[PDB]
Amino acid sequence: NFGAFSINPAMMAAAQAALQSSWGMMGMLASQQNQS
Amino acid sequence: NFGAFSINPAMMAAAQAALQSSWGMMGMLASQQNQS
Amino acid sequence: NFGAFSINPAMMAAAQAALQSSWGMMGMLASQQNQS
Amino acid sequence: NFGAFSINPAMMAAAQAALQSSWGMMGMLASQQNQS
Amino acid sequence: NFGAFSINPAMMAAAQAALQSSWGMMGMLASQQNQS
Amino acid sequence: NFGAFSINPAMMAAAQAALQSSWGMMGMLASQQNQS
Amino acid sequence: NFGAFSINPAMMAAAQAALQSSWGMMGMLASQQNQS
Amino acid sequence: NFGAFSINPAMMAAAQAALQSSWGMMGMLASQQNQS
Amino acid sequence: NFGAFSINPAMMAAAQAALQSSWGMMGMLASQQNQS
Amino acid sequence: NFGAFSINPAMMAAAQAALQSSWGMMGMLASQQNQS
């Protein structure tokens, strides 16, 4: 049903630059329940 | 039914620059229930 | 049903640059329950 | 049902650069329960 | 059901560079319970 | 500024019952950037 | 600024019952960047 | 700034009961970057 | 800044009961970068 | 900055009971990088 999901940041820092980044709590989760 | 979802920020910082970014709680989740 | 998900940041630091990054809590998780 | 998920950051540091990175709590986990 | 998941960072450090990295708590874990 | 947030589901299953539940991607995340 | 967050499900299963539950990707994460 | 976060599920199983549970990828993670 | 986080499930199994549980990938992780 | 984190499950099994539990990949990890 579902996809396939890429994550690809480019990230460049020049001469006297300052850069931060962060990622958290990302992904796939699912449930099934099947009863006679 | 569903997709496939890319995430790709470009991010550039010049000479005396300051840059921050953040990401959280992103993804796919689904449920099924199937009963006789 | 689901995908296959790549993660690939490029990351470049110039002459006097400063760069940080971080990642946490990423992946796949699922559940089944099946009862007669 | 599920994928196969690559993780591959490229990471370059120039002449007087400074770079940090981090990763934690990433993977797959699942459950089954099956009762007569 | 599941995948097979590669991890392969490239990592380059130039002349006067400084680079750190880290990884922790990554893998697969699962459970079964089966009752008559 | 913020709270403190409890999560406490009660959950009861009778004689021949069937019950599933799930939770994912829940928490707090924040950012600061402070520049002279 | 922030809280302190309890998680405490009660969970009861009767005579011939069936019950499943799950939790994933929950917690706190934050970032600082401070530049002269 | 942050809390202190308890996790304490109660969990009871009666005579012919069946019960499963699971937890994964939970905790705290943070970053600092400080540049002259 | 941060807490101190207890984990304490109670867990009871009656006469003919069946019970499973699981935990994985839980803890604290952090990073610093400090540059002149 | 951080805590001190207890883990203490209670766990009781009655007359004809069956009980399993598991824990893995739990702890603290951190990084520093400090450059002149």
mmCIF file with all atom_site columns, N, CA and C in Angstrom, chain J:
data_model
loop_
_atom_site.group_PDB
_atom_site.id
_atom_site.type_symbol
_atom_site.label_atom_id
_atom_site.label_alt_id
_atom_site.label_comp_id
_atom_site.label_asym_id
_atom_site.label_entity_id
_atom_site.label_seq_id
_atom_site.pdbx_PDB_ins_code
_atom_site.Cartn_x
_atom_site.Cartn_y
_atom_site.Cartn_z
_atom_site.occupancy
_atom_site.B_iso_or_equiv
_atom_site.pdbx_formal_charge
_atom_site.auth_seq_id
_atom_site.auth_comp_id
_atom_site.auth_asym_id
_atom_site.auth_atom_id
_atom_site.pdbx_PDB_model_num
ATOM 1   N N  . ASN J 1 1  ? 24.041 17.880  34.211 1.00 0.00 ? 1  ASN J N  1
ATOM 2   C CA . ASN J 1 1  ? 22.858 18.224  33.442 1.00 0.00 ? 1  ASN J CA 1
ATOM 3   C C  . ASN J 1 1  ? 21.791 17.172  33.622 1.00 0.00 ? 1  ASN J C  1
ATOM 4   N N  . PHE J 1 2  ? 22.236 15.925  33.607 1.00 0.00 ? 2  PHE J N  1
ATOM 5   C CA . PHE J 1 2  ? 21.383 14.761  33.432 1.00 0.00 ? 2  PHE J CA 1
ATOM 6   C C  . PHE J 1 2  ? 20.989 14.169  34.782 1.00 0.00 ? 2  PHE J C  1
ATOM 7   N N  . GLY J 1 3  ? 20.491 12.942  34.765 1.00 0.00 ? 3  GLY J N  1
ATOM 8   C CA . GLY J 1 3  ? 19.754 12.412  35.886 1.00 0.00 ? 3  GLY J CA 1
ATOM 9   C C  . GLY J 1 3  ? 20.430 11.476  36.848 1.00 0.00 ? 3  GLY J C  1
ATOM 10  N N  . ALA J 1 4  ? 19.746 10.360  37.105 1.00 0.00 ? 4  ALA J N  1
ATOM 11  C CA . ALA J 1 4  ? 20.227 9.059   37.555 1.00 0.00 ? 4  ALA J CA 1
ATOM 12  C C  . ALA J 1 4  ? 19.016 8.144   37.447 1.00 0.00 ? 4  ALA J C  1
ATOM 13  N N  . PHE J 1 5  ? 19.058 7.058   36.681 1.00 0.00 ? 5  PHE J N  1
ATOM 14  C CA . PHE J 1 5  ? 17.796 6.458   36.255 1.00 0.00 ? 5  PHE J CA 1
ATOM 15  C C  . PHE J 1 5  ? 17.652 5.014   36.729 1.00 0.00 ? 5  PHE J C  1
ATOM 16  N N  . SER J 1 6  ? 16.681 4.788   37.599 1.00 0.00 ? 6  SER J N  1
ATOM 17  C CA . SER J 1 6  ? 16.443 3.471   38.157 1.00 0.00 ? 6  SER J CA 1
ATOM 18  C C  . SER J 1 6  ? 15.593 2.633   37.223 1.00 0.00 ? 6  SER J C  1
ATOM 19  N N  . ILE J 1 7  ? 15.792 1.320   37.301 1.00 0.00 ? 7  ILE J N  1
ATOM 20  C CA . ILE J 1 7  ? 14.964 0.345   36.602 1.00 0.00 ? 7  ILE J CA 1
ATOM 21  C C  . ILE J 1 7  ? 14.677 -0.768  37.589 1.00 0.00 ? 7  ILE J C  1
ATOM 22  N N  . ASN J 1 8  ? 13.411 -0.994  37.890 1.00 0.00 ? 8  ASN J N  1
ATOM 23  C CA . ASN J 1 8  ? 13.029 -1.952  38.924 1.00 0.00 ? 8  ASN J CA 1
ATOM 24  C C  . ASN J 1 8  ? 11.645 -2.502  38.668 1.00 0.00 ? 8  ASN J C  1
ATOM 25  N N  . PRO J 1 9  ? 11.537 -3.521  37.827 1.00 0.00 ? 9  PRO J N  1
ATOM 26  C CA . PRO J 1 9  ? 10.256 -4.202  37.662 1.00 0.00 ? 9  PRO J CA 1
ATOM 27  C C  . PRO J 1 9  ? 9.997  -5.195  38.778 1.00 0.00 ? 9  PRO J C  1
ATOM 28  N N  . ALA J 1 10 ? 8.784  -5.159  39.289 1.00 0.00 ? 10 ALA J N  1
ATOM 29  C CA . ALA J 1 10 ? 8.288  -6.246  40.107 1.00 0.00 ? 10 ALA J CA 1
ATOM 30  C C  . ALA J 1 10 ? 7.630  -7.255  39.187 1.00 0.00 ? 10 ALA J C  1
ATOM 31  N N  . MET J 1 11 ? 7.591  -8.505  39.630 1.00 0.00 ? 11 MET J N  1
ATOM 32  C CA . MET J 1 11 ? 7.210  -9.576  38.720 1.00 0.00 ? 11 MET J CA 1
ATOM 33  C C  . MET J 1 11 ? 6.805  -10.792 39.533 1.00 0.00 ? 11 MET J C  1
ATOM 34  N N  . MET J 1 12 ? 5.542  -11.177 39.439 1.00 0.00 ? 12 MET J N  1
ATOM 35  C CA . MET J 1 12 ? 4.969  -12.219 40.276 1.00 0.00 ? 12 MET J CA 1
ATOM 36  C C  . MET J 1 12 ? 4.339  -13.259 39.368 1.00 0.00 ? 12 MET J C  1
ATOM 37  N N  . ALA J 1 13 ? 4.477  -14.531 39.715 1.00 0.00 ? 13 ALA J N  1
ATOM 38  C CA . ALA J 1 13 ? 3.881  -15.607 38.932 1.00 0.00 ? 13 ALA J CA 1
ATOM 39  C C  . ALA J 1 13 ? 3.122  -16.541 39.860 1.00 0.00 ? 13 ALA J C  1
ATOM 40  N N  . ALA J 1 14 ? 1.844  -16.753 39.567 1.00 0.00 ? 14 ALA J N  1
ATOM 41  C CA . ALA J 1 14 ? 0.984  -17.576 40.406 1.00 0.00 ? 14 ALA J CA 1
ATOM 42  C C  . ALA J 1 14 ? 1.161  -19.046 40.043 1.00 0.00 ? 14 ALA J C  1
ATOM 43  N N  . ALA J 1 15 ? 0.201  -19.869 40.488 1.00 0.00 ? 15 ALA J N  1
ATOM 44  C CA . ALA J 1 15 ? 0.345  -21.321 40.624 1.00 0.00 ? 15 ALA J CA 1
ATOM 45  C C  . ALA J 1 15 ? 0.758  -22.023 39.331 1.00 0.00 ? 15 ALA J C  1
ATOM 46  N N  . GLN J 1 16 ? -0.055 -21.909 38.284 1.00 0.00 ? 16 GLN J N  1
ATOM 47  C CA . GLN J 1 16 ? 0.250  -22.544 37.007 1.00 0.00 ? 16 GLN J CA 1
ATOM 48  C C  . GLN J 1 16 ? 0.633  -21.520 35.950 1.00 0.00 ? 16 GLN J C  1
ATOM 49  N N  . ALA J 1 17 ? 1.200  -20.401 36.378 1.00 0.00 ? 17 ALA J N  1
ATOM 50  C CA . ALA J 1 17 ? 1.387  -19.259 35.503 1.00 0.00 ? 17 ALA J CA 1
ATOM 51  C C  . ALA J 1 17 ? 2.534  -19.487 34.525 1.00 0.00 ? 17 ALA J C  1
ATOM 52  N N  . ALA J 1 18 ? 2.629  -18.580 33.560 1.00 0.00 ? 18 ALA J N  1
ATOM 53  C CA . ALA J 1 18 ? 3.746  -18.537 32.628 1.00 0.00 ? 18 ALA J CA 1
ATOM 54  C C  . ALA J 1 18 ? 4.082  -17.072 32.405 1.00 0.00 ? 18 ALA J C  1
ATOM 55  N N  . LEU J 1 19 ? 5.353  -16.708 32.539 1.00 0.00 ? 19 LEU J N  1
ATOM 56  C CA . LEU J 1 19 ? 5.745  -15.314 32.405 1.00 0.00 ? 19 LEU J CA 1
ATOM 57  C C  . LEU J 1 19 ? 7.104  -15.236 31.737 1.00 0.00 ? 19 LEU J C  1
ATOM 58  N N  . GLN J 1 20 ? 7.258  -14.287 30.822 1.00 0.00 ? 20 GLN J N  1
ATOM 59  C CA . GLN J 1 20 ? 8.540  -14.008 30.197 1.00 0.00 ? 20 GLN J CA 1
ATOM 60  C C  . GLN J 1 20 ? 8.777  -12.512 30.285 1.00 0.00 ? 20 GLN J C  1
ATOM 61  N N  . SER J 1 21 ? 10.036 -12.089 30.257 1.00 0.00 ? 21 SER J N  1
ATOM 62  C CA . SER J 1 21 ? 10.330 -10.680 30.062 1.00 0.00 ? 21 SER J CA 1
ATOM 63  C C  . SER J 1 21 ? 11.677 -10.554 29.359 1.00 0.00 ? 21 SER J C  1
ATOM 64  N N  . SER J 1 22 ? 12.050 -9.328  28.987 1.00 0.00 ? 22 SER J N  1
ATOM 65  C CA . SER J 1 22 ? 13.283 -9.081  28.245 1.00 0.00 ? 22 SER J CA 1
ATOM 66  C C  . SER J 1 22 ? 13.643 -7.605  28.309 1.00 0.00 ? 22 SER J C  1
ATOM 67  N N  . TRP J 1 23 ? 14.943 -7.322  28.259 1.00 0.00 ? 23 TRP J N  1
ATOM 68  C CA . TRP J 1 23 ? 15.453 -5.958  28.167 1.00 0.00 ? 23 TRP J CA 1
ATOM 69  C C  . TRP J 1 23 ? 16.728 -5.947  27.345 1.00 0.00 ? 23 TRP J C  1
ATOM 70  N N  . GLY J 1 24 ? 16.932 -4.883  26.581 1.00 0.00 ? 24 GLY J N  1
ATOM 71  C CA . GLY J 1 24 ? 18.151 -4.767  25.804 1.00 0.00 ? 24 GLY J CA 1
ATOM 72  C C  . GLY J 1 24 ? 18.406 -3.347  25.367 1.00 0.00 ? 24 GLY J C  1
ATOM 73  N N  . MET J 1 25 ? 19.686 -3.027  25.172 1.00 0.00 ? 25 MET J N  1
ATOM 74  C CA . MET J 1 25 ? 20.133 -1.756  24.597 1.00 0.00 ? 25 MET J CA 1
ATOM 75  C C  . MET J 1 25 ? 19.564 -0.571  25.373 1.00 0.00 ? 25 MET J C  1
ATOM 76  N N  . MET J 1 26 ? 20.077 -0.433  26.584 1.00 0.00 ? 26 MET J N  1
ATOM 77  C CA . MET J 1 26 ? 19.643 0.623   27.478 1.00 0.00 ? 26 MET J CA 1
ATOM 78  C C  . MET J 1 26 ? 20.850 1.209   28.193 1.00 0.00 ? 26 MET J C  1
ATOM 79  N N  . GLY J 1 27 ? 20.915 2.532   28.257 1.00 0.00 ? 27 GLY J N  1
ATOM 80  C CA . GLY J 1 27 ? 22.048 3.161   28.908 1.00 0.00 ? 27 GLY J CA 1
ATOM 81  C C  . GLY J 1 27 ? 22.231 4.597   28.444 1.00 0.00 ? 27 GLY J C  1
ATOM 82  N N  . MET J 1 28 ? 23.423 5.114   28.712 1.00 0.00 ? 28 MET J N  1
ATOM 83  C CA . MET J 1 28 ? 23.769 6.499   28.445 1.00 0.00 ? 28 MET J CA 1
ATOM 84  C C  . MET J 1 28 ? 24.979 6.561   27.531 1.00 0.00 ? 28 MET J C  1
ATOM 85  N N  . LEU J 1 29 ? 24.986 7.536   26.626 1.00 0.00 ? 29 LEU J N  1
ATOM 86  C CA . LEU J 1 29 ? 26.124 7.701   25.738 1.00 0.00 ? 29 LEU J CA 1
ATOM 87  C C  . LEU J 1 29 ? 26.210 9.155   25.309 1.00 0.00 ? 29 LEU J C  1
ATOM 88  N N  . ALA J 1 30 ? 27.427 9.672   25.211 1.00 0.00 ? 30 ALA J N  1
ATOM 89  C CA . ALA J 1 30 ? 27.589 11.095  24.961 1.00 0.00 ? 30 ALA J CA 1
ATOM 90  C C  . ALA J 1 30 ? 28.912 11.355  24.271 1.00 0.00 ? 30 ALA J C  1
ATOM 91  N N  . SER J 1 31 ? 29.047 12.569  23.760 1.00 0.00 ? 31 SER J N  1
ATOM 92  C CA . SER J 1 31 ? 30.194 12.931  22.957 1.00 0.00 ? 31 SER J CA 1
ATOM 93  C C  . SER J 1 31 ? 30.599 14.357  23.277 1.00 0.00 ? 31 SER J C  1
ATOM 94  N N  . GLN J 1 32 ? 31.889 14.634  23.127 1.00 0.00 ? 32 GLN J N  1
ATOM 95  C CA . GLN J 1 32 ? 32.399 15.990  23.293 1.00 0.00 ? 32 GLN J CA 1
ATOM 96  C C  . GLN J 1 32 ? 33.330 16.207  22.115 1.00 0.00 ? 32 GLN J C  1
ATOM 97  N N  . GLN J 1 33 ? 33.394 17.423  21.596 1.00 0.00 ? 33 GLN J N  1
ATOM 98  C CA . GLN J 1 33 ? 34.496 17.788  20.716 1.00 0.00 ? 33 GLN J CA 1
ATOM 99  C C  . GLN J 1 33 ? 34.874 19.222  21.020 1.00 0.00 ? 33 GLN J C  1
ATOM 100 N N  . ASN J 1 34 ? 36.158 19.460  21.255 1.00 0.00 ? 34 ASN J N  1
ATOM 101 C CA . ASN J 1 34 ? 36.633 20.740  21.746 1.00 0.00 ? 34 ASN J CA 1
ATOM 102 C C  . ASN J 1 34 ? 37.891 21.117  20.985 1.00 0.00 ? 34 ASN J C  1
ATOM 103 N N  . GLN J 1 35 ? 37.832 22.220  20.244 1.00 0.00 ? 35 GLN J N  1
ATOM 104 C CA . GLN J 1 35 ? 38.919 22.589  19.344 1.00 0.00 ? 35 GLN J CA 1
ATOM 105 C C  . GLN J 1 35 ? 39.356 24.021  19.585 1.00 0.00 ? 35 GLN J C  1
ATOM 106 N N  . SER J 1 36 ? 40.666 24.229  19.682 1.00 0.00 ? 36 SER J N  1
ATOM 107 C CA . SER J 1 36 ? 41.235 25.571  19.724 1.00 0.00 ? 36 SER J CA 1
ATOM 108 C C  . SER J 1 36 ? 41.033 26.309  18.410 1.00 0.00 ? 36 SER J C  1
#
